[PDB]
């Protein structure tokens, strides 16, 4: 529908220390906009940069034009799942999965997040990240499913950027029409939060296009 | 000027077998469009997919809006150089350099290209590539200079895509104002070629933008 | 630490989003660098992936260290140590694992988490086309006061050939210990026996530290 | 024969700076020892750490036991070639090739070396490297080809280590027997050099093994 709800629970760990986060949100799938509120349930206060979590906190919330087949909106009411590996340049690596289902007008996410090898004096473990830059995801078919790798970067507390390469596999629960090679522009932003990020308001604007 | 000239020479090797290519072209830097005709002088007929070369055959040919500092157009008349690593997903990797100078209204490229570890049954050696797909390049400043990364993909013959990780370092020959984080959309196309790619007409269209607001 | 030590572990994890859980008990000789264990699948069975991606997660205390190489791991006890590991396979599949090692009398206790993603449906892992890990030589070096370990490891495949994986591990002692110099550890891990569905597995590994070509 | 000599010329560039080096050397292939003296012919004084070149300056100089097929000694008198990518952890990447022939008792190398994207503040451009650590190479057959991977590391003058991933493809000029998965221990050492490394005396010891028995 034009206004949809979001409910999620993320269970995960970073450098072996476990945590859990829950969120409620709402979004406009055809306008490619969404927002949500999250609150650390376990493992707080988080000792790592919250920004590594945010892109894990749904490509149905993307404005697709009529000329590009919409893989994600097709998959419902059954839904879809995805897996993702996020490779940071300093060796830190996060693996994540999300199983997305639909209950009425509410998407339900079951999330697992696992990051390892983040250096003690790195920007993640020292909370020196500021914000994800906006980005352009490249989506393409392989083995009958959809993949979407990206060239991400976090702006840092004194300038400069901290790069991370995202690799994702999108799997529909049913048979859907596979799209052609296309792109999705992203802009994810934390609009507000408390001191230790126990509470976080997160927004994302995502839009598909066919390149130049 | 609104219309610029282009002359180039690439000397290189792929899997240890040397080759050399020269080209002539022209473009409109403020429109971000260019075209050129390339001829292989040595090492022909090339035993690898010509497409691995095309992105090596100049970001001055990109339409920059006023809201984004133009590092490349600033760097002239002195010019600039760039270094690039091209890591394909099956282990083949090409490293390339280009020293760009200006003589009147003509850009001069001196290009080196060396690719290795392309598997014999891979799409490059078997020449099963069709086209580069359009791409979006991410530019950011690091330690005083400018970088550019692209996650590119080659369209293949039987369907599917063959990905390549681009990583480029841009160095102006003079000090210029460094730009903020931004993007450049690309679309490179071989519009015409002869059978063994001894002659190639190559086009590229490029535009910088700041991404979604 | 004694010539004969005990092991039991529990691993909880998921591969391509399919969760599973495994428990094991074992024994070994830390000063001889040999060990063996029996593992049982408790949840997520029958496992739909190659069991071989799990085995290197199922302890560098079981490595024969010569006197001239500082033993980072044997020093860390009785308090113990932990490690994190990223295993980067050449076809894009990636596994992250952690192990928190404690000591109870003569028994090592492992708390293990394992998470692998992006394994293609037709790749050797999901199709269980792996045979065994080849022997390997680990390279260990200090960075930021802790110990690192990288190996170029390869799985032999079921009709000839090898399937590569990049191991990169951070070792973290829970107390202050003396840091070693750059050194090596030779490995050979082998599944000695198992039932048809890999619900039961008997796993062994031998390891020996050295300092390269003398 | 137990005593062989070496003569080589390497032509290359690092970050777009071309250079050339020639060397003469000697070794005992059946014991896995060799040494050579290298002289910089062009591009001196080299502005990068000489350590990036040495593993490019022949696995015929490795002691192979009887129970492991020797791909390299089988490859002569015709010889063999190899291609290699060396991926440093800070993004620096070098591509190298070597075409190895035999003239009487002298191995002749034709070497190309191309390194890109080394940061100006990194240990290579700053020249803060000490030596390569010993290493163990893993070799295996793929696609009728012999492959070689090493996780290398450079010791730095402050204790730390600067890792590099080695990927090499070995190709005999004739069809020869292929070995099973095995290992080669390495220890490469610069035993002497002048201040700006215009003269370098390089040694390497290597011995193949099957791993932990």
How far is residue D64's CA from residue A13's CA, in Å, rounded to a whole number?
Answer: 46
Burial class (CB in 10 A: 0-12, 13-18, 19+), B198: middle
Residues 6+ apart with CB under 8 A from B159: none
**Breaks after residues in chain B, judged by C–N over 2.5 Å:** 57
- DSSP annotation of B3 reads S
Question: Is the separation of the CB atoms in D70 and D102 below 8 Å?
Answer: no
Answer yes or no: do B144 and D120 touch at CB < 8 A.
Answer: yes
User: What is the rounded end-to-end Cα distance, in angstroms, of chain B?
Assistant: 31
The DSSP 8-state label assigned to residue D52 in this structure reads G
Residue C8 in contact with residue C23, Cβ under 8 Å? yes
Chain A residue numbers with beta carbons less than 8 Å from the beta carbon of B182 are none
Residues composing chain B = 213
Chain B residues with CB-CB distance to D114 below 8 A: 95, 97, 112, 114
Helix-strand-coil split of chain C, %, nearest 5: 5, 60, 40
Q: How far away is chain B from the Cα of D147, in angstroms, using its nearest Cα?
A: 10
Q: Is the peptide bond between A45 and the residue preceding it cis, with omega within 30 degrees of 0?
A: yes
3-class DSSP state for residue D39? strand
Q: How far apart are CA C200 and CA C193, in angstroms?
A: 8
At A203, list the tokens: 């927004």
Shortest CA distance from D111: residue in chain B: B16
Classify A136 as helix, strand or coil. Answer: strand
Q: In angstroms, what separates the C-alpha of B39 from chain D's closest C-alpha? A: 23
Helix (H, G, I), strand (E, B) or coil at D60: coil
3-class secondary-structure state, position B123: coil
Angle in degrees, CA C88, C90, C92, rounded to 5 = 70
The count of other CB atoms within 10 Å of the CB of residue C105 is: 8
Dihedral in degrees, nearest 10, Cα atoms D138, D140, D146, D147 = -50
* CA D85/CA D87 separation, integer angstroms: 6
Neighbouring C-beta atoms of residue C174, cutoff 10 Å: 15
Backbone angles phi, psi at B69, to 5 degrees: -60, 135
- DSSP SS3 for A149: strand
**Burial of A117 per CB tally in 10 Å (0-12, 13-18, 19+):** buried
Residue B211 and residue A133: Cβ atoms within 8 Å?
A: yes
Q: What is the bridge-based pairing of β-strands B4-14 and B106-116? A: parallel
Q: Which residues pair with D170 in a beta bridge?
A: D82, D146
Which residues in chain A are closer than 8 Å to B136, comparing Cβ atoms?
Answer: 136, 138, 183, 211
The tally of domains found in chain B comes to 1
Our measurement of the distance from residue D159's CA atom to the centroid of its chain's CA atoms, rounded to an integer in Å, reads: 24
Closest residue on chain A to B213 (Cα): A187
CA gap B205, A180 in Å, rounded: 21
Query: Are the Cβ atoms of B85 and D116 closer than 8 angstroms?
Result: yes
Instruction: Answer yes or no: do D136 and C207 touch at CB < 8 A.
Output: no
Provide the resolution (angstroms): 1.9
CA distance, residue A110 to nearest chain C CA (Å): 10
Count other C-beta atoms under 10 Å from residue A111's C-beta.
21
Residue A46: Cβ within 10 Å count = 19
Residue C75 is inside which H or E element, if any?
A: helix C72-75
What is the rounded distance in angstroms from the CA atom of residue D177 to the CA atom of residue C95? 36
- Give chain D's radius of gyration (CA, Å): 17
Cross-chain Cβ contact D97/B85 below 8 Å: no
Minimum distance, in Å, between the CA of residue C127 and any CA atom of chain A: 14
On chain D, the residues whose CB falls within 8 A of the CB of B13 are: 97, 112
Q: Could you give the CA distance from residue A109 to residue C56 in angstroms, rounded to a whole number?
A: 31
- Please, which residues have CB within 8 angstroms of residue A195's CB and are 6 or more apart in sequence? none
| Separation of first and last alpha carbons in chain C | 29
> Is A169's CB within 8 Å of C117's CB?
yes
Residue in chain C lying closest to A16 (CA): C98
Spatial distance between the Cα atoms of C80 and C73, rounded to a whole number of angstroms: 8
Name every chain B residue with its beta carbon within 8 A of the beta carbon of A135: 138, 211
Q: Which chains touch B (3 or more CB pairs under 8 A)?
A: A, D
Chain-chain contact of D135 with C139 (C-beta, under 8 angstroms): yes
CB-based contacts of A84: which residues, under 8 Å, 6+ apart? A56, A94, A95, A96, A97, A166, A167, A168, A169, C117, C118
- The three-class DSSP label of residue B26 is strand
**Residue D107: CA count within 13 A, CB half-sphere:** 31
Q: Within 13 A of C145's CA, how many CA atoms are on the CB side?
A: 8
DSSP for A75-110? TTTT-EEEEEEEEETTS-EEEEEEEEEEETTEEEEE
Q: Find tokens 């750490």 and name the residue.
A: D49
Q: Which residues pair with A163 in a beta bridge?
A: A153
Please report where in the chains the tokens 């792996």 appear, as a residue: C130
Q: How far, in Å, CA of A195 to CA of A192, rounded?
A: 10
Q: Is residue D17 part of an annotated ligand binding site?
A: no
C204 marked as part of a ligand binding site: yes
With contacts defined as CB-CB under 8 Å, which chain B residues touch A142? 160-161
Question: What would the DSSP string read from start to end of B28-76?
Answer: ETTTTEEEEEEEEEESPSPSS-THHHHTT--TTSSB--TTS--HHHHTT
Q: Return the closest-CA partner of residue C15 out of C95, C92, C100.
A: C95
In angstroms, the CA B24 to CA B34 distance is 11
Length of chain D: 213
Helix (H) or strand (E) run with residue D124 in it: helix D123-126
Cα atoms in the 13 Å half-sphere on the side-chain side of D73: 19
CA atoms within 13 A of residue A145's CA, in its CB half-sphere: 18
Is residue C162 a known part of a binding site? no
Please give the Cα distance from A71 to C97 (Å, whole number): 32
- Beta-strand ranges (E) seen in D117-198 are 129-132, 135-142, 145-156, 161-172, 182-193
List, in sequence order, every residue forming a beta bridge with A30; answer none if it has no partner.
none
Q: Are C149 and C139 in contact (CB under 8 A)?
A: yes
Range of the domain at B53: 1-213
CB-defined contacts B:D, below 8 A: 77
Q: Which residues contact A156 (CB under 8 A, 6 or more apart)?
A: A123, A128, A129, A130, A162
Residue from A209, A205, A172, A211 nearest A73 by CA: A172
Tokens of B41: 């002088």
Q: Where is A6: in which H helix or E strand?
A: strand A4-14
* Secondary structure (DSSP) of A26-79: EEETTTTEEEEEEEEEESPSP-S-THHHHTT--TTSSB--TTS--HHHHTTTT-
- Tokens encoding D170: 């070995």
Query: Would you give the distance in Å from CA B57 to the centre of its chain?
Result: 5
- CA B12/CA B9 separation, integer angstroms: 10
Of C201, C33, C212, which Cα lies nearest the Cα of C140?
C212
Phi first, then psi, for residue B54 (nearest 5°) are -65, -40
- For an interface test with C, give the residue of A95, A118, A123 to mutate (most C CBs within 10 A): A95
Q: Measure the CA–CA gap between C179 and C186, rounded to whole angstroms.
A: 19
The token duo for A210 is 């066919």
Q: Which two tokens mark D142? A: 């793929």
Residues of D within an 8 Å Cβ radius of B = 13, 15-16, 81, 83-85, 91, 93-97, 99, 112, 114-117, 119-121, 142-145, 167, 169
Q: Which two tokens stand for residue A53?
A: 């979590």
- Report CA Rg, chain C: 17
Do D25 and D35 form a contact (C-beta atoms < 8 A)?
yes
């Amino acid at each position: 529908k034009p206004d949809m709800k979001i409910k999620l629970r993320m269970e995960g760990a970073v450098n072996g220390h476990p945590f859990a986060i829950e969120g409620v949100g709402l979004g406009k799938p055809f306008e490619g906009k969404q927002s949500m509120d999250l609150k650390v349930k376990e493992g707080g206060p988080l000792p790592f940069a919250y920004d590594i979590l945010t892109t894990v906190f749904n490509r149905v919330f993307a404005k697709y034009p009529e000329n590009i087949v919409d893989y994600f909106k097709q998959s419902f009411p059954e839904g879809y799942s995805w897996e993702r590996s996020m490779n940071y340049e300093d060796g830190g690596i996060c693996n994540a999965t999300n199983d997305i289902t639909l209950d009425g007008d509410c998407y339900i996410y079951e999330i697992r997040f696992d990051g390892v090898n983040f250096p003690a004096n790195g920007p993640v473990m020292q909370k020196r990240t500021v914000k994800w830059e906006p980005s352009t995801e490249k989506l393409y078919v392989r083995d009958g499913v959809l993949k979407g790798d990206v060239n991400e970067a976090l702006s840092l507390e004194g300038g400069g950027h901290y790069r991370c390469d995202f690799k994702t596999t999108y799997k529909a629960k049913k048979v859907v029409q596979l799209p052609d090679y296309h792109f999705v522009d992203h802009h994810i932003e934390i609009k507000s939060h408390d001191k230790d990020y126990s509470n976080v308001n997160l927004h994302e604007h995502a839009e598909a296009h066919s390149g130049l």
